[PDB]
CSV table of C-alpha atoms (C1' of nucleotides) in Angstrom, one decimal:
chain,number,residue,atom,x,y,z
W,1,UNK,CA,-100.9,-106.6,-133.5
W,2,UNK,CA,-97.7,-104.6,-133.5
W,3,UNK,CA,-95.3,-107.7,-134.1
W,4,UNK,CA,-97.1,-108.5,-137.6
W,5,UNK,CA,-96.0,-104.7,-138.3
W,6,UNK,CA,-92.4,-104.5,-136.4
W,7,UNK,CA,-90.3,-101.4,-135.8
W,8,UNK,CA,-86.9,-102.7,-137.2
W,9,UNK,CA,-84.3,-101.2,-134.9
W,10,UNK,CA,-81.6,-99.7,-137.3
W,11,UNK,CA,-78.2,-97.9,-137.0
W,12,UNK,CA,-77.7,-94.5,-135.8
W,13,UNK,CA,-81.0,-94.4,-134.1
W,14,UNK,CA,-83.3,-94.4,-136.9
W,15,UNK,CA,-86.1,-96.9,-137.0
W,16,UNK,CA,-87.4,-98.9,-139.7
W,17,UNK,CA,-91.3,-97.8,-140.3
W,18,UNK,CA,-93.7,-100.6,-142.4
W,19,UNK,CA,-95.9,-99.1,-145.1
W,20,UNK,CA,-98.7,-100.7,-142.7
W,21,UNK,CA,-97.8,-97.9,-139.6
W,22,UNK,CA,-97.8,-95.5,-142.3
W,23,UNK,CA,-101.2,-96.2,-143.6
W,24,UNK,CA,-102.5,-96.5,-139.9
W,25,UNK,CA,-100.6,-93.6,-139.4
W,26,UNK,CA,-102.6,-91.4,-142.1
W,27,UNK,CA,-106.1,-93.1,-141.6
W,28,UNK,CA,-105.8,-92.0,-137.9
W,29,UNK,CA,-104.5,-88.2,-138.4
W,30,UNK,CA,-107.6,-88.3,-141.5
W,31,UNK,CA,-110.0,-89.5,-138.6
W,32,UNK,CA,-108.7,-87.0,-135.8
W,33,UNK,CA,-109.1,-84.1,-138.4
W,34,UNK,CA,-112.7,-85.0,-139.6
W,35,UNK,CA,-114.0,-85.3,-135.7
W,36,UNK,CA,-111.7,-82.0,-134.7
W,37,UNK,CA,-113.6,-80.2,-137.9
W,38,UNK,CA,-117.2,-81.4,-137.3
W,39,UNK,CA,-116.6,-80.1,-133.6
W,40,UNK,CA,-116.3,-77.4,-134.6
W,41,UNK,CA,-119.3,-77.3,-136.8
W,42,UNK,CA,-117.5,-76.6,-140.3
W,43,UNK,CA,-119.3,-75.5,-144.0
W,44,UNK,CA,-120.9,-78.6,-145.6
W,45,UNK,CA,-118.3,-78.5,-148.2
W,46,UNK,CA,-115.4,-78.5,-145.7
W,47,UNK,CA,-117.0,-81.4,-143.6
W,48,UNK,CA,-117.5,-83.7,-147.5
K,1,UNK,CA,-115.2,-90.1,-193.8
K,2,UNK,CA,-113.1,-88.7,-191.2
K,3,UNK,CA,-114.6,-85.0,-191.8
K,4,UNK,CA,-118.4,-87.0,-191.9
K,5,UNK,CA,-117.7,-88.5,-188.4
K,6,UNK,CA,-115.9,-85.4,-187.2
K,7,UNK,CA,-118.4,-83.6,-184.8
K,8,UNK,CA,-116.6,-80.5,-184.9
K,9,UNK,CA,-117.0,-77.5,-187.4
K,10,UNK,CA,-114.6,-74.7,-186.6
K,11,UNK,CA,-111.7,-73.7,-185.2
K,12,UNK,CA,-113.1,-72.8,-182.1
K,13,UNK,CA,-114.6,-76.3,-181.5
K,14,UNK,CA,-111.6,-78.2,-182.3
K,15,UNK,CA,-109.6,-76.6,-180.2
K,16,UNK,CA,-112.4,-76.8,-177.3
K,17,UNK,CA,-112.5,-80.7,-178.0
K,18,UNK,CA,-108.7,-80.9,-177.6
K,19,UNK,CA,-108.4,-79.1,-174.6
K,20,UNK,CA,-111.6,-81.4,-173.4
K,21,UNK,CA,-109.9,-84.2,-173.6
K,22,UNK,CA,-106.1,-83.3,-172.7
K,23,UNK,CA,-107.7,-81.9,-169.3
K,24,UNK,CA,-110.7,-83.2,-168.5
K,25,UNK,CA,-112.7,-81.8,-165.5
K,26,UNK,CA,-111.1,-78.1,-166.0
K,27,UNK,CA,-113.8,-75.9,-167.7
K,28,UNK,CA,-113.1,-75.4,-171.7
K,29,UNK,CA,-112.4,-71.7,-172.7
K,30,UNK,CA,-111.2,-69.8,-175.9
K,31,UNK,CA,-107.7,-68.6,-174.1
K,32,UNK,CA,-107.1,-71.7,-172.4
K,33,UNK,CA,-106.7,-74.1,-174.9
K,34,UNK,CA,-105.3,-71.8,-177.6
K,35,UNK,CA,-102.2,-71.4,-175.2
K,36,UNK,CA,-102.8,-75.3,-174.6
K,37,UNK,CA,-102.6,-76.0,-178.3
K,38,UNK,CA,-99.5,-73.6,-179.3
K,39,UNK,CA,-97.3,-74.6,-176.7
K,40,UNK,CA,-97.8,-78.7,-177.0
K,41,UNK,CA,-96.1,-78.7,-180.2
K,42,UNK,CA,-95.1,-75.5,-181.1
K,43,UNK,CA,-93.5,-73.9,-178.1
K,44,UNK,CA,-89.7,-74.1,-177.4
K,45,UNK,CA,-89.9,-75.5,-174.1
K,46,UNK,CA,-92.3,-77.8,-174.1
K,47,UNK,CA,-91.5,-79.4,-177.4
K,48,UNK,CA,-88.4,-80.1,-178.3
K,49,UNK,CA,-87.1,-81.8,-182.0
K,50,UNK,CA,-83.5,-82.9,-181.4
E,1,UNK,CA,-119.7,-63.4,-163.5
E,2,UNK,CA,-117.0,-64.2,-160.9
E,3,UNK,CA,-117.3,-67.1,-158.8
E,4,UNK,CA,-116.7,-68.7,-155.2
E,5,UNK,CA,-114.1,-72.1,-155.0
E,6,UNK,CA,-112.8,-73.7,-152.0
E,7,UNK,CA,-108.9,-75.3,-152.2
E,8,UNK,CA,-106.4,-77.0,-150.2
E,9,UNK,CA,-102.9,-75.3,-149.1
E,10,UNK,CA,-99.6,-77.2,-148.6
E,11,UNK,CA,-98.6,-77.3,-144.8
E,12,UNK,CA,-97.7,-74.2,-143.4
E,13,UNK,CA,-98.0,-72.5,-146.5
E,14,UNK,CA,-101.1,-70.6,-146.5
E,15,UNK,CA,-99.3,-67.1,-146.3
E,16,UNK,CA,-97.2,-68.1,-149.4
E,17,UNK,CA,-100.6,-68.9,-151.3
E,18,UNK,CA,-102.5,-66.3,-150.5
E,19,UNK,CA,-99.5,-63.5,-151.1
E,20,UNK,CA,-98.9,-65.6,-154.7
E,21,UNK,CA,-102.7,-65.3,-155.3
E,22,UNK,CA,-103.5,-61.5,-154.0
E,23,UNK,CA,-100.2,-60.7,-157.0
E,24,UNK,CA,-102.2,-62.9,-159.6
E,25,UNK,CA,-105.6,-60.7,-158.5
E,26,UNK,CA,-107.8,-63.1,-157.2
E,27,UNK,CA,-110.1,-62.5,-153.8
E,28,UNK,CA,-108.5,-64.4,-150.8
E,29,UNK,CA,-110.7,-65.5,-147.9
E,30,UNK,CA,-109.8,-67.5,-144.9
E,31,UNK,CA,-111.1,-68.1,-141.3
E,32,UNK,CA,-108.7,-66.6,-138.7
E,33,UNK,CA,-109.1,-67.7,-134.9
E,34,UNK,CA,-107.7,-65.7,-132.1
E,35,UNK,CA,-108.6,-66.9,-129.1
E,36,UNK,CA,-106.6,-70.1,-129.2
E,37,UNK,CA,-104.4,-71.6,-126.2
E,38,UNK,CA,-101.9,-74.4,-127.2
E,39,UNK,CA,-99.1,-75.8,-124.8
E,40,UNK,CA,-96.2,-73.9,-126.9
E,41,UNK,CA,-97.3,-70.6,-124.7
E,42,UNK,CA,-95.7,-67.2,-125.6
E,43,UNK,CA,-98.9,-65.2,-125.6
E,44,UNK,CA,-101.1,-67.7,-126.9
E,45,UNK,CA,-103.5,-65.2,-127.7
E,46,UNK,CA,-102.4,-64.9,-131.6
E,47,UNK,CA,-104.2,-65.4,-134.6
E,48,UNK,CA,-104.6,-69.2,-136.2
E,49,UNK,CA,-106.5,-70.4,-139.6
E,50,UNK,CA,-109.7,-71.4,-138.7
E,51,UNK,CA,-110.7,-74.2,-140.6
E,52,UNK,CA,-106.6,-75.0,-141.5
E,53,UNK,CA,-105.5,-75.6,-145.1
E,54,UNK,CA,-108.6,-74.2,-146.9
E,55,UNK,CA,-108.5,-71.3,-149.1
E,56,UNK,CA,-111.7,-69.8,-150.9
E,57,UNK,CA,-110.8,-68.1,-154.1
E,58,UNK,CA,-113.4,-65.3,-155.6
E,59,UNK,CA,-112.1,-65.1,-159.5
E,60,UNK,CA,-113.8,-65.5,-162.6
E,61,UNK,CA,-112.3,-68.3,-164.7
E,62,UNK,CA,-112.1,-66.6,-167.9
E,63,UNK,CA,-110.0,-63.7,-166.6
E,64,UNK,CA,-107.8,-66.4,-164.5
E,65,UNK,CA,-107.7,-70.4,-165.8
E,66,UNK,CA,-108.3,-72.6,-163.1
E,67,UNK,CA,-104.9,-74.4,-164.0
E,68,UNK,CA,-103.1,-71.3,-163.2
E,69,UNK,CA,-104.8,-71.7,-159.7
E,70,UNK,CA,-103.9,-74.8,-159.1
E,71,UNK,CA,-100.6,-73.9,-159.2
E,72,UNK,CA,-99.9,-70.8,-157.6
E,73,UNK,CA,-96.7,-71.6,-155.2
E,74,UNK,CA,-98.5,-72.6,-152.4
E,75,UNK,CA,-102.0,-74.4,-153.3
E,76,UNK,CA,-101.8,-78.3,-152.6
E,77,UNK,CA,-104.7,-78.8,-154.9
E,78,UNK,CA,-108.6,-77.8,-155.1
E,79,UNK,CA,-111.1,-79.3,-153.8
E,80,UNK,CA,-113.4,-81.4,-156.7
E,81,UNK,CA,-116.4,-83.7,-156.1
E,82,UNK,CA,-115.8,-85.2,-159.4
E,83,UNK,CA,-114.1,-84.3,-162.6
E,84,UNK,CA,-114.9,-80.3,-161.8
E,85,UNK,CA,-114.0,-78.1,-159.3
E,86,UNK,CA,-116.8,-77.6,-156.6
E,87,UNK,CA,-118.3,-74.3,-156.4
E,88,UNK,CA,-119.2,-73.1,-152.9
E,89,UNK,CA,-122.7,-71.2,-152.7
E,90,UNK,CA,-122.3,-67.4,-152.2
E,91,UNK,CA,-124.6,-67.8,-148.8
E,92,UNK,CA,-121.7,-70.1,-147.3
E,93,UNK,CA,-119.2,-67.3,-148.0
E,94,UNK,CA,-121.9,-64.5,-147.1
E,95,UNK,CA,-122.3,-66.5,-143.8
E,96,UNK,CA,-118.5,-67.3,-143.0
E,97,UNK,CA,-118.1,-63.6,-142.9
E,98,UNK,CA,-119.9,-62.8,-140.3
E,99,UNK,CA,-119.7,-66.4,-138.7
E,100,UNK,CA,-116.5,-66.5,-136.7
E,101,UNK,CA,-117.1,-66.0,-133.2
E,102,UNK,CA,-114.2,-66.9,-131.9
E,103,UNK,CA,-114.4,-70.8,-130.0
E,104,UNK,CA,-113.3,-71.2,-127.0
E,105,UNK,CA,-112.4,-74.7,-127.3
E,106,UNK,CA,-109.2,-76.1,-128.3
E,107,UNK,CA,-107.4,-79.2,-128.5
E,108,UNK,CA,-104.9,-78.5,-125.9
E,109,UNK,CA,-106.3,-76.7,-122.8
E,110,UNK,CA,-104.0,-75.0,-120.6
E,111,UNK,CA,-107.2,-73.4,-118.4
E,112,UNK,CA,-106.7,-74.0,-115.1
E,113,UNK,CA,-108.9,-76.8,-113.3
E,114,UNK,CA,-107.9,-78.9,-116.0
E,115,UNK,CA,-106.7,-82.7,-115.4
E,116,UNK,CA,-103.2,-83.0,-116.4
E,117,UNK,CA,-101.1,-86.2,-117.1
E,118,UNK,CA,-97.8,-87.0,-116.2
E,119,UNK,CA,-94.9,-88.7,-117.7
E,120,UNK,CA,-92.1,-88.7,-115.5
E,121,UNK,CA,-90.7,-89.7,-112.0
E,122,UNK,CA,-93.1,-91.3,-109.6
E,123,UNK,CA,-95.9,-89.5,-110.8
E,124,UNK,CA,-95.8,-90.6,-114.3
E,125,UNK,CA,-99.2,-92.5,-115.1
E,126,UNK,CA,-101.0,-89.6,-112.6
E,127,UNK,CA,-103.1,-86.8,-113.2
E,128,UNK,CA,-102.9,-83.4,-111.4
E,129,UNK,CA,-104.8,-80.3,-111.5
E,130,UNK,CA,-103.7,-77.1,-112.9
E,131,UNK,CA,-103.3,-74.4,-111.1
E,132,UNK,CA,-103.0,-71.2,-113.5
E,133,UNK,CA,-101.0,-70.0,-116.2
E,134,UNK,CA,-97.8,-68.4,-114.9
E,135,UNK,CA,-95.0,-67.4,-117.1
E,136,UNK,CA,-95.4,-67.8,-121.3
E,137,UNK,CA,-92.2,-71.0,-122.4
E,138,UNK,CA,-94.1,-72.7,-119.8
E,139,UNK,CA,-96.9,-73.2,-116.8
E,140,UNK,CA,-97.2,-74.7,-113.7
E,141,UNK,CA,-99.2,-78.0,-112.1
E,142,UNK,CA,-100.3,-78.6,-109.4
E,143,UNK,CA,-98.7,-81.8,-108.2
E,144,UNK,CA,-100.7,-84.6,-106.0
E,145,UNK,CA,-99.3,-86.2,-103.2
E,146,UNK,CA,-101.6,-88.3,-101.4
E,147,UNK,CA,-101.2,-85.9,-98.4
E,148,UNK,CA,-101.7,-82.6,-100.1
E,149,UNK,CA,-101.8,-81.1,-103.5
E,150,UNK,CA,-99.1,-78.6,-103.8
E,151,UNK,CA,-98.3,-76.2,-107.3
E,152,UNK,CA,-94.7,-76.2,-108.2
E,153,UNK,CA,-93.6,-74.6,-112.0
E,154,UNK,CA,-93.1,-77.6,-114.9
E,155,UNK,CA,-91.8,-77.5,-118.8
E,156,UNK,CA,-95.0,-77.1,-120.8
E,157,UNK,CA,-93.7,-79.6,-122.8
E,158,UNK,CA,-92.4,-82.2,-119.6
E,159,UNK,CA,-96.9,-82.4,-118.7
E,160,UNK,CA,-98.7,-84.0,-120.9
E,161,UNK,CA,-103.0,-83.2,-122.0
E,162,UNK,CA,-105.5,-85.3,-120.2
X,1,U,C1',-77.2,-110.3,-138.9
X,2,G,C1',-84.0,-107.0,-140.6
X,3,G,C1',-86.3,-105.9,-144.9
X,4,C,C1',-87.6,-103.4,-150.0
X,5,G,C1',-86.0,-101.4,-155.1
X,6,G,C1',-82.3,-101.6,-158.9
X,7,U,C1',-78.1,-104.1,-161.3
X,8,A,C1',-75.3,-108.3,-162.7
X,9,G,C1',-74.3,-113.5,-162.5
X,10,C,C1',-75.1,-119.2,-161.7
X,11,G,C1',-77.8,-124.1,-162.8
X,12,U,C1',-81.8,-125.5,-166.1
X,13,G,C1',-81.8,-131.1,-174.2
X,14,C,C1',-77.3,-132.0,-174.4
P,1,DG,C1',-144.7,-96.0,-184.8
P,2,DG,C1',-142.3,-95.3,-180.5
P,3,DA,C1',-140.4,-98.3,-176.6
P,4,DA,C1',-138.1,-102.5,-174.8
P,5,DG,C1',-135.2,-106.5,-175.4
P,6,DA,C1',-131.0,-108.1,-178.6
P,7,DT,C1',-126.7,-107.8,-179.8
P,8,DC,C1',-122.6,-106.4,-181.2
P,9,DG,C1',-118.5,-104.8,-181.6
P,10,DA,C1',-115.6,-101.6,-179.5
P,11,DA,C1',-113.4,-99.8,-175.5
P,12,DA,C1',-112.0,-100.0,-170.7
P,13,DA,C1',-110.4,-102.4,-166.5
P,14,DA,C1',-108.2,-106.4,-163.9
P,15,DA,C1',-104.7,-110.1,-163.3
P,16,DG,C1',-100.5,-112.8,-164.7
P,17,DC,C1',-96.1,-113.4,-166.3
P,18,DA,C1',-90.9,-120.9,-163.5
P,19,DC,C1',-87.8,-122.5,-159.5
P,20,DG,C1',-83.7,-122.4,-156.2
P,21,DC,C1',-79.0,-119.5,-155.2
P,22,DT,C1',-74.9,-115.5,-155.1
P,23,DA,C1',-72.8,-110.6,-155.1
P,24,DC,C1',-73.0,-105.2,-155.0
P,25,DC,C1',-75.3,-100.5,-154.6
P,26,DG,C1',-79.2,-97.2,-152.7
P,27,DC,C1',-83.0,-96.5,-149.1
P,28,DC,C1',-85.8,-97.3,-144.7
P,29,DC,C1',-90.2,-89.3,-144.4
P,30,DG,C1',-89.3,-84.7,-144.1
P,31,DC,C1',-90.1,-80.2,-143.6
P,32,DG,C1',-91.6,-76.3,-141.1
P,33,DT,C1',-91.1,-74.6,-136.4
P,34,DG,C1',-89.4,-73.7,-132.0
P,35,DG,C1',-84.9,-73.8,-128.8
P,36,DT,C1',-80.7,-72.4,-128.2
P,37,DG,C1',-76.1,-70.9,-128.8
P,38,DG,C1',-72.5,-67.8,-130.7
S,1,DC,C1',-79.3,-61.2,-135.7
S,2,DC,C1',-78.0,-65.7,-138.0
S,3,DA,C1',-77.1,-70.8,-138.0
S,4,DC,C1',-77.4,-75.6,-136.1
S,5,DC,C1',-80.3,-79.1,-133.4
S,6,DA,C1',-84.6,-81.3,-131.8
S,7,DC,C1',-89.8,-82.2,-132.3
S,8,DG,C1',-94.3,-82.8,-134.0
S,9,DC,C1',-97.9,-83.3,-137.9
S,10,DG,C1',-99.4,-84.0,-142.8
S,11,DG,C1',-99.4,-86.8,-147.8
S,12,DG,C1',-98.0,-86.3,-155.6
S,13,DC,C1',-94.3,-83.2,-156.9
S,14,DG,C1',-93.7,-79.2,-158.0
S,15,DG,C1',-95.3,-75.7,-160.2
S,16,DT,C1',-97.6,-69.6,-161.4
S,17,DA,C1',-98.1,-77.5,-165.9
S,18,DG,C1',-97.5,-81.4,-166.9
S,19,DC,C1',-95.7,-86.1,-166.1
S,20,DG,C1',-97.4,-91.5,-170.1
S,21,DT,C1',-95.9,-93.8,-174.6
S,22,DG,C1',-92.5,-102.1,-177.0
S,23,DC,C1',-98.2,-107.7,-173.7
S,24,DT,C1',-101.8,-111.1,-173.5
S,25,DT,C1',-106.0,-113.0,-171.9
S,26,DT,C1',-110.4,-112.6,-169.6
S,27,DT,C1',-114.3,-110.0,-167.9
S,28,DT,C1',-117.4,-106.0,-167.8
S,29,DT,C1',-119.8,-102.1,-169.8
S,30,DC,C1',-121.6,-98.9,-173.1
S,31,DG,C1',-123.0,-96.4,-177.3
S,32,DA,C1',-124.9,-97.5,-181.3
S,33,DT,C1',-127.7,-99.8,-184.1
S,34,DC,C1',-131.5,-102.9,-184.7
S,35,DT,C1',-135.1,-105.1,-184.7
S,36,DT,C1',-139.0,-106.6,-183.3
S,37,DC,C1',-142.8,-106.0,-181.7
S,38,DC,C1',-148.4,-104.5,-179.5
RNA sequence: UGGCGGUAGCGUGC
DNA sequence: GGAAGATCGAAAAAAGCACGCTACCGCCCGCGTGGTGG
DNA sequence: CCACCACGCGGGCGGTAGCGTGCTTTTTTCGATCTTCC
C-alpha cells in the first residue's frame, strides 16, 4: 500500500522518494521493456 | 615445494595465470596480461611508492 | 578469426560509442527504425535504434582486448551469460541484416481513429477520437460532447495515450 | 516538525 | 583393479556485533532532451 | 545561434581500468586423497 512507502513532502517542492518506489520503480520499467522487446519479436540473446 | 606445487612452467603461463585470476571471465592473451603485469607494479600511474 | 559480441550503451549515448569504437577499428552494427510516430511530433518520420541500447561489435580479441571494449566512452557494459562474454551466432547477425522491415507499431500512436484520454477540464477521465495529424509541436482531437463529436487543435503533450 | 549516513558527547563497579 | 562411499581439511559464504538520550553537518536522482527566450 | 528552465526514462562509475586490503563463529561445499571394497 502506498502509506507503508510514503512520499515525504519536503521544502522547495522536492519530494522524499523510499528506496521501496525506487525498486518498484525499476522492476516495472525492466518489465515494460521485456514485454515492449518480445513485441517486437527480438534475437534470442536480446530477449535472455 | 613451492616450484613442485607450482603448475606453471614459463613465462608465458605465469603471466596467463595472473591475468586469470586478476580478471576472471575476460579471455587470457599474450598482450593483455603483459600490459596487465607491467603496469600493476611497475607503471608510474598505477603504482605509486611514496 | 574475428568474432560477433552484443553490448549494452549508456542512455542516449549510442552515437558517442559507436564514433569511439569506429576510431578504435572495430565493426559497428545497430538496428535503425524509421517509421516511428511518438507524441513529440516534428516529422516523426526520423530514424530510432531499433532494439535500444544494444551494440554488436565484429572485432577479433587479440587485435582489440575486450577490456578496451568495455570501456570505450560510451559502452555501459557487455552483455555475459556467465563469467565470459556471450558470443552471438553469425546467422543472427546474417539475419538482422536483412531483417528490419520497418514496424508499424509503436508505443505511442498518434494514427487517427485512435482512443485518446484526457486529463483536463470536464473531459478529463474521457476518451475521444482522433481526427488526423495536423501541424508537427502538436495534433488535434476530436472532442466528445454527448451531442456531437467536434475536432478542435490540442498540445500533444495536454492529450494523453489510451 | 519526516527520515537515512557521518561526526562528537552523556549515563553505565565505584 | 577401477568405482563408490568416507572423510578431511581447506576454502567460501552468511550473520552478529548492549540500552536509552543529546547536538551538528550532508542528502533525500539526474541527465539528456525539448521549449523558449534573448 | 547560445543559454536557462521544464520533463520524462533508465540504473556502478567512469573509463579508451580498476576500485578491496585491522573479526569471530557457524554452516556449506569441494578438491583431494583414501580406502575399501566385489
Amino acid at each position: 500500500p502506498p502509506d507503508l512507502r510514503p512520499l515525504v513532502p519536503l521544502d522547495g517542492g522536492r519530494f522524499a522518494t523510499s528506496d521501496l518506489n525506487d525498486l518498484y520503480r525499476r522492476v516495472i520499467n525492466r518489465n515494460n521493456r521485456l514485454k515492449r522487446l518480445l513485441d517486437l519479436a527480438a534475437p534470442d540473446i536480446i530477449v535472455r | 615445494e613451492t616450484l613442485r606445487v607450482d603448475p606453471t612452467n614459463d613465462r608465458l603461463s605465469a603471466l596467463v595465470e595472473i591475468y586469470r585470476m586478476m580478471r576472471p571471465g575476460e579471455p587470457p592473451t599474450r598482450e593483455a596480461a603483459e600490459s596487465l603485469f607491467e603496469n600493476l607494479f611497475f607503471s608510474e600511474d598505477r603504482y605509486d611508492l611514496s | 578469426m574475428q568474432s560477433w559480441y552484443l553490448l549494452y550503451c549508456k542512455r542516449g549515448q549510442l552515437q558517442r560509442a559507436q564514433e569511439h569504437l569506429e576510431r578504435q577499428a572495430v565493426n559497428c552494427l545497430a538496428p535503425m527504425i524509421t517509421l516511428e510516430k511518438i507524441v513529440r511530433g516534428k516529422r516523426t518520420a526520423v530514424s530510432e535504434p531499433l532494439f535500444p541500447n544494444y551494440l554488436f561489435v565484429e572485432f577479433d580479441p587479440e587485435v582489440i582486448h575486450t577490456t578496451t571494449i568495455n570501456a570505450t566512452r560510451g559502452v555501459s557494459h557487455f552483455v555475459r551469460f556467465g563469467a565470459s562474454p556471450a558470443i552471438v551466432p553469425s546467422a543472427v547477425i546474417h539475419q538482422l541484416s536483412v531483417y528490419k522491415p520497418k514496424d508499424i507499431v509503436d508505443p505511442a500512436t498518434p494514427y487517427p481513429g485512435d482512443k485518446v484520454i484526457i486529463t483536463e477540464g470536464a473531459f478529463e477521465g474521457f476518451q475521444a477520437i482522433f481526427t488526423e495529424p495536423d501541424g508537427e509541436a502538436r495534433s488535434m482531437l476530436l472532442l466528445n460532447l454527448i451531442n456531437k463529436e467536434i475536432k478542435h487543435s490540442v498540445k500533444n503533450t495536454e492529450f494523453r495515450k489510451l
